[PDB]
Amino acid sequence: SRPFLADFNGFSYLELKGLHTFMALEMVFLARGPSGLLLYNGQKTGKGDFVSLALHNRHLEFRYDLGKGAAIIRSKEPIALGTWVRVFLERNGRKGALQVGDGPRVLGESPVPHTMLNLKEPLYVGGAPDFSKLARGAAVASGFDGAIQLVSLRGHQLLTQEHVLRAVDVAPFAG
Template sequence: MCDVVSCANDGACFANRADGYICLCPLGFKGALCEESFSLSSPLFNETMFSYAVIQWPQSSQSYLSFMEFEVTFWPSAPSGVLLYSDDAGSKDFLAINLVDKYVEFRFDCGSGEAVIRSEEQISLDSWHELRVSRTAKSGILHVDNQRPIGGIAEGAFTQINCSSALYIGGVPEYEKTKRTAGVMKPFTGIIQKVCNRVQ
């Protein structure tokens, strides 16, 4: 089907069944053939305004997760701040992605001990960066831009995380109520363009 279809504006055609197709459009374009342009804005977070965004987890609040993966595209304007955070009020469980003096940190606790995974190199301010974190049971991996992936393992025996709170992006409503070992100290300043997640 894609041999007779032409997606506009550098869209890519993919066959989604024997007699069908879909055009995957670049940012800023939509429509069956990526023919429609639209204005796209990215949320700007500001430390002095204590701004943050809230999204709900796709599964129920009492789900215990063995696997999770997040991809984040961001533009930092300050060297430190929280990118993503969620926790469980009734246990030690949490997950956090922080920027700490221009290093990216992925922290999580399955309830019996934390893992702290830190990028090898600092990132630059005022430029776009991509990160991906994944956690399977007690093992976590952090990828930042083209840096070497870094792995780590949480202490203790527990292998699942329950996050009963919402997923906070760019900050949290009350910093004094975050888990002490999560390293969540201050809001993020800059742009967070994309957050994608998969959980099981």
């Protein structure tokens, strides 16, 4: 159960067992690049259900598709690169919330009627092995350049050695 402070270089990723194995998610990270994939979990391999978190020009964006198209919930502020950021994601059926640090929650929702997320695939953190297999609705094309200190699901910590199925070009954070 040793935690590890994971460093991603843009073409890196961690593969963990899918979120279904273990919605409230917290991540603590420090970004060196303004865009890239932070978290992804899907149903299948360009459509089907998915949940994602990503950076897009310093904005966090939380997306999910429950069968009727994607919610897109974007941080109010851009993050400061080179700093430690805490982000909280919540979903209750269609309704979602994104909170960065101590800031106000940003709210959004996916379209009516679908309320339930069907995840089957592994959980990807910091990037993915093949961006062509990810849902088009996630709107991501690159991995994260930065470090991740924490990934938790409902308070359970996922970023420990025991959880890793595969780590590709992931280093211990130094700088």
